[PDB]
Homo-oligomer: A and B are copies of this chain.
Amino acid sequence: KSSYFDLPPMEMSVAFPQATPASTFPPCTSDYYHFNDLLTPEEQAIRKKVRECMEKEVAPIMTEYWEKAEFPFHITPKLGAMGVAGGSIKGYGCPGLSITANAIATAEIARVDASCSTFILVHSSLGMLTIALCGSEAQKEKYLPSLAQLNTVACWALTEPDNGSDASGLGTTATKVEGGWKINGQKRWIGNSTFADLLIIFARNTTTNQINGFIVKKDAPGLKATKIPNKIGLRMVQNGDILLQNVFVPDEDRLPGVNSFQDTSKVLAVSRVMVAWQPIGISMGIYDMCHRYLKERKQFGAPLAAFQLNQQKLVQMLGNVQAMFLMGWRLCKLYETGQMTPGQASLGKAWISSKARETASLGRELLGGNGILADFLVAKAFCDLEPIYTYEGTYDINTLVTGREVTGIASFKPAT
């Protein structure tokens, strides 16, 4: 204890005057290859709209809510006001955007905050889309409209403690009963699960021994989703462990499209493209912050940006960014032309996430001390990126998916 131990933290205005925190978000200096040429007039407008609605409403409060690992619920309606939820889904009260537009949207969110980016992505590109492609016409018209407006929040539940990367061999059972199903099993890592209204839980149809999709409602008897604590990244994203004991799902709430796991590998085709755009966004932000910081912070009687070592670090980031964008952009134009294959998308996410790590690592050390402060974005984004490298297919798995497709030989399984 001390007479000054209880006193509130020093204001950033007094504690470190030389540099401007992320509270007032940096200008877009990462767009060095003038990317608006690769975007359509409408895509450009969505890009600008999201960017502004993020620097205004999320940028100030994000620093506080990340430390507390609490979700900023009062921001939800502001995100549904951007018109991004639903994204790729056409009709059913959804914006109906192009894959390039829905991707550049994700970017300009992850740029300011990766946490709020994953929240929407899991809800929109995994939750909503699964209903939009595998659901029935009765389900699409029922749920989607409210989900696109963010009045109701959905979550995607494929992963288990026992089965992660080997997702196709999951152990949650879906026993057929009169009038519906009884879902029994456990889930781990599901974002939004602790507060989600709709829980798209994947389970094993005990009759067919195949994987089926189920829309599980909130608070449903036998369902218990508890918060996963102590995350170093994506701290605002409420990830949880789901328990399922005789959870009833009526025949009307089973997804008719999912009848094996191969059916899921059409939703993932969009999901993998969209996740691939998160690092593209994050890295841009990391640069934008570094560019300003190195120009504001003075040491040895000169801005940091004047020193050879710092410049080489900055341009390596700038170079990594330009390539990462073009990579993700091309990936979209492959999906749009309808000639995109699992391997191309798996290469996309893997490569981009890898260079994003390098870019984040350089950015983090460039700010030195304040490089470990979430006040200055880079530190938060450095941490925020680590799960992204792993989730939606770990680097190693993706590189092996692209491996299998190109070589023609599968090398996933062990020897034995």
Contacts and interface: CB of A to CB of B under 8 A. Distances in A.
Given A333-B37, A373-B231, A194 B2 contact: yes
Contacts of A320: 351
A28 interface: no
A-B pairs with lowest CB-CB distance, top 7: A311-B403, A308-B308, A302-B414, A319-B351, A305-B407, A326-B326, A230-B374
A364 interface: yes
A33 B165 contact: no
B226 A7 contact: yes
B307 A416 contact: no
Interface string A357-389: 100010011001101111100011011001101
A314 B407 contact: yes
A324 B163 CA distance: 36
23 contacts: A2-B195, A5-B227, A17-B161, A33-B330, A34-B334, A164-B299, A165-B299, A166-B300, A230-B373, A230-B379, A231-B372, A231-B374, A231-B379, A232-B383, A291-B406, A291-B407, A308-B308, A311-B399, A311-B400, A319-B354, A319-B402, A411-B415, A414-B415
A247 to B, nearest CB: 12
Interface string A190-201: 000011000000
A340 to B, nearest CB: 10
Contact of A368 (B224, B322, B394, B402): B394
B309 A312 contact: yes
Interface in A183-231: 188-189, 194-195, 218-219, 223-231
Interface residues of A, number: 126
A314 B226 contact: no
Contacts of A63: 230
Given A32-B347, A308-B403, 18 more contacts: A2-B194, A2-B219, A9-B241, A17-B161, A29-B406, A37-B337, A165-B368, A230-B379, A232-B380, A301-B413, A305-B409, A308-B309, A315-B402, A318-B347, A326-B329, A368-B394, A369-B390, A411-B414
A410 B319 CA distance: 19
**Best-surrounded residue of A16, A294, A303 (most CB of chain B within 10 A):** A16
Contact of A34 (B299, B339, B375): B339
A399 B369 contact: no
Given A232-B372, A307-B411, A372-B232, A365 B344 contact: no
Interface in A137-164: 159, 161-164
A123 to B, nearest CB: 16
Contacts of A37: 333, 337
Given A15-B161, A16-B188, A318 B387 contact: no
A169 to B, nearest CB: 8
**Best-surrounded residue of A164, A334, A389, A406 (most CB of chain B within 10 A):** A406
A316 interface: yes
Contacts of A365: 389-390, 394-396
B414 A18 contact: no
A266 to B, nearest CB: 20
A224 B330 CA distance: 51
